[PDB]
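Input set for joint prediction.
Command: fold jointly, output tokens.
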Amino acid sequence: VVILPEGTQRYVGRDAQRLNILAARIIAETVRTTLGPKGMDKMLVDSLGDIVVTNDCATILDKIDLQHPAAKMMVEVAKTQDKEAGDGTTTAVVIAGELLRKAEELLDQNIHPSIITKGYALAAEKAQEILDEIAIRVDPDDEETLLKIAATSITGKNAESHKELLAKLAVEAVKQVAEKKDGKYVVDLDNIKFEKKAGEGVEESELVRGVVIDKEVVHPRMPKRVENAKIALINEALEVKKTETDAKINITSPDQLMSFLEQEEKMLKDMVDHIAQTGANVVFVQKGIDDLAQHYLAKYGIMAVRRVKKSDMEKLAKATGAKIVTNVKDLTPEDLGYAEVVEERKLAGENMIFVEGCKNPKAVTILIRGGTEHVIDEVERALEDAVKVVKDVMEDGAVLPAGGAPEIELAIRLDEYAKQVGGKEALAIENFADALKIIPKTLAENAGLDTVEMLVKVISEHKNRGLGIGIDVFEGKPADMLEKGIIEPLRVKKQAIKSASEAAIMILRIDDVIAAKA
Amino acid sequence: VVILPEGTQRYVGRDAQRLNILAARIIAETVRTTLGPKGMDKMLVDSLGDIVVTNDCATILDKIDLQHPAAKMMVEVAKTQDKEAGDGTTTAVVIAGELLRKAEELLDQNIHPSIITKGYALAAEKAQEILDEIAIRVDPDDEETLLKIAATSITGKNAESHKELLAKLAVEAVKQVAEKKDGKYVVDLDNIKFEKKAGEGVEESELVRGVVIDKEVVHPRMPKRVENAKIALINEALEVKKTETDAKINITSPDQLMSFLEQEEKMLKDMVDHIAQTGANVVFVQKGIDDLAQHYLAKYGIMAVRRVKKSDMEKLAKATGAKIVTNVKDLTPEDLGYAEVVEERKLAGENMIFVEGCKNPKAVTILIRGGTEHVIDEVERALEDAVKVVKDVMEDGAVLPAGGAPEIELAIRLDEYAKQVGGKEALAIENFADALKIIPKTLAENAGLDTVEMLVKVISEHKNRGLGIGIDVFEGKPADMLEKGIIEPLRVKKQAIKSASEAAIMILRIDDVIAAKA
Amino acid sequence: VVILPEGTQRYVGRDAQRLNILAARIIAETVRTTLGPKGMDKMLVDSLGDIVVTNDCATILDKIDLQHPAAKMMVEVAKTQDKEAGDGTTTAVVIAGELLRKAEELLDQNIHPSIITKGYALAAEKAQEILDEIAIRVDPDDEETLLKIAATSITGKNAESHKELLAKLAVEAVKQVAEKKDGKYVVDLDNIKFEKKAGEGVEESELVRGVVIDKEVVHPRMPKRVENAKIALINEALEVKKTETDAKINITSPDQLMSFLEQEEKMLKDMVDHIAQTGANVVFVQKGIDDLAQHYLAKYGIMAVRRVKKSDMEKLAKATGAKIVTNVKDLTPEDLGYAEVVEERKLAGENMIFVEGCKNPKAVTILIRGGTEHVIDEVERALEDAVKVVKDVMEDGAVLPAGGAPEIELAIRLDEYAKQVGGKEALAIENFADALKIIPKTLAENAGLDTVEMLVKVISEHKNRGLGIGIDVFEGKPADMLEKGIIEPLRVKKQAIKSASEAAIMILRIDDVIAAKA
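tokens >
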């Protein structure tokens, strides 16, 4: 009896499970090659012929037009991992896929899904306790470890060629805009700006302790360089003001055509005169600046810039120390900010404004350079991750070794937790534990090593030498990730297991899929 | 650079392996609920609209219009298993599929298919050894075991309602046509005819120590019943014979128009006179019988039948002891066969000839009755299987318990063989051993029993009590198959493992699939 | 100005070279995974749905529907190699592709194709000299090496599971039909029949020192088994013969109807009586057998078979020693052949005739069994190669180590030959030599070993220990092929280089491709 519309597709029970799992697995496989130090990249081309070349899992899954629903749900694991910890986007998706693969073996063994699901929840919760226990507490601002966290982040990416320079820029940037409340640091990444410009190479990238703005000096006669700039920030337009209430001038005598025109000029000259009087020799305005206003500004030798982005005004304030004033009339010397140099400079032929040498900038800019626009964008993506993992360690003074060490550690301990629990749930906990091994595994795989062998050795060596024993892909054998400085924020593992677990459990609970005709 | 025509599709490596294994697995999953005493049936409607209702895996995979290359390969397994042993077609395919499923777990672990293939080959070869060892040597013609074999074969099929009767008919039929040369029996199933007529019920099916031909007595005046029949078998037509070489009569006088007519009449009369003179009272002719010959045959009180199939002539020869004569002229009394009764009877209002009560018939007929055409057709299929297993056991003198017992013994033993082999091969041997457990597992599954627990209890009981321990889908617990009388020919398992394994290995060696545009 | 019709495609110079070379390379990369002991198989499905599963390069390229012209030319390399030496079809193709790839490096360098061509011819000619010198001369009939040859040939193919049995059968078949004229052996492969029936496993395959025919005994009363059979071979139908010249019978009296009828009857009986008179108890007729002749044939207790294939009649003659007679009347006791047993046996339910126990059979049969039809076909193909390499060795008492030893030996030596030639031709000779390394490289690659490292170790070890050093794919290191018994005929390498080089040079001389519209 016709219940559903013609064209509606539907799968139930094993069908639903098999397809959902297979689709999540294929997605995971698709991106496992971006994982690690020998990670490779993808070139994505949308319908508009727009190109994206990247190593970033989240970006990849977000940019690809995915059809299958289970596949789409995997995009959420990467996106969340990304927002929360930066790195580990591939790891989360890869573990999710492997978790579902091991789950199916139990499904085919006729083990009820809720039992599998119960076991996975237990394993996931035990994994968080284990990660907290084995987490290496470090000094929130120890430039040493921070620099290590950064450099690790950048490894395996296009910009790894200059990981030392880039790591330095990121760590420095985070340290500078970091704010300490009471021993605990808090970091707002919005205070770190990334400015991009093709030209030169990635080597020439730099950290400006101030702000770099893609704008020009409004008038030709204004100074193109100011030494110890006294900076005024105004968001209101430097134009003839009109009331909010509707108004119109009623002219009744010829002498008024001039009196009103001179009044509007006077209003405009006073705004500029006021600015000058505060001692400001540099002015950034959010809205526009009329030609007349530009004229007096120049005559005063004051450098001005109009139509500045609200987000830039805010960074300018935080770096220079100036206070954004809404109406010019309220501008006072106390409001002015400072900058060792404010100068218009041409990059790749196009003018820009550098506000550098600020006292104790609370906002900073990393100027990215590179031989190509595509190179430029990927370097930016990598810097975003690097600055985020650095941030993570300053907010949570905890790190972990990489190389698959933590997942190997979890694998070992979860296996014993399974024995304590027993029953069919143990079968689920053990499978969850074995699933964690894809990380160590695909790390080797991507390096071109022998998966079966490497695992045997790493797990063995790990059992003999402890928590820091992971896989050194470059060397092709187990090693102490800690001694080698290959570490990552505790938050990376934690969030990855959380997102991977909850996604897997959700998919596992599905036994009926109903899709309407598109 | 184009190498291949458009419309050509291709899959390499993991893709190829994944698609081939999934197709084979799905085909195996499709036929698995037909397995065992709790097995169910399928209804197949082809393109023309013809309907087939059966439980036979071999018949099912043959009637289905399968597309995928890998699925078509599974058809070969069931088909070969069917020609060789009769029973075990579902079993062979299901093991085939599970074998591939367990293999993919090793493929996903990066174990080289060459290794897996070698290990599987080792387990397969070893399995045949174990089977030959644990096989129960029985008396080739033991009535009791033969009936058990036939009854086990029939149970789980549509005709199980009358398994006792049908098993009886099957065993008796094979015993009657068996040829012992030197202690070794040899059966030609072509000497056992299955005749079907809807009407009555299956309970009315019977064994005729002779033949039943779907033919009528050619002439109305001939006898419809003949007691102690002296049967003649002629294949040449009882009509005016014409030379092989072209010939024509040249009439040159009126007197010849009658002389040639009378000569042809004479020749015809002589054929019949000659037959009558041998003492024959019943005559079976392969070709036609001229109306005049019919007339004279009737005057002699001789019952004749024409256009009898060659296969029917040969069975009549083997049943009655008569000798097929090519030319009437060569017929002598020594060529005549015997029959306690030859008679024309109407089954479902349609006339048929019964040749029964023959001395020591070397060819026999099982007449199948049923309340429907579809029922009779499926009963026929069940009887073909019963006669085949009863046959396997008379040529081989070995049986095995069923209920999953053999596969459980094999799993246990092969698991130990894996250990002495060691290395990666051992991994494959272990997975091959475990694969064999789908039989015991699907038997419980089809019966609605908790697969996980049944399997643990069965393996436990087997290790304690031995070879005969299998699953009893009725008692819903492990039991001694031997004591319950649940046995099957040893050739069933031997062949099943051979076709399943050689098919699995072949599919496992495929890493490239190239299909043209249809 | 239009010269060529629309739809005509054209490529000149580098475009033409690039295209042809890329197509040839891709074809080569397509079959390289089938190379060696770890070689894998392909599944081919044509436009009609027919399925072929092989590892055989010649079969693969022959079944695929290739479009590009250069790719088709590669097919010829494989077919010729297959006809000349059986094994080495992948090697020839893979080397041709590699030769072309290395040559394009010189083309990009602007080295005139004429130079590359000259150099390649020089290297190819020297290669044959080197091969003739390093070839290990052996006893054309030395059983041990012969078995090593056959076994080496079978490894890496689907049937490798039973290489020992199949190697023995192959060697045996070839020895038994080989003909030594004057110390020099000559083998006609037409004397070895490959008969196949699905059922059992490949272990049940065997060698019949006689012939196996897929025919039945014509009459039901004839013997089904003849012990010390005296075999008659007639290729003329046992029927009423007719003149070649047109002829008709003109009947003028009624008594001629029976006289001519009787005359034809006597003609058939005379034929059969004549055959009986020779003492023959088994007769094989190429054409038909009239029913009356069958009747009399059966009365003489003579087993008869009709419609025997011409090629089968010829094998029976060579196996039994019988002489094929055209006209029955010419048959004499001296024409009769012998067989220890001629018997009708059923295989997979189908009747077949076995002619075994023949004196010194000059023709023989290898019966192939197996779990599926696809398995059997692949076994046959593996057997065709095995019997072909065994033949090469008996006809050329020379062999070579495999595992990539000859090609490594050639690379080293040809590299030196380049030095004594010098100049641009020398660049070509060095590239030719370098090209030969894809065999060792692809052997390692198919095993999943590290290609670059294995080449360094193998070449090194080879330089120190000698000719026999090749790659041990299973142990994963260099090894002495000769000691391992891994050898192949000298003809395989020779023909492979000849075809690979003559083909590469031809493609290399093409600077213009003009293809019409199909």
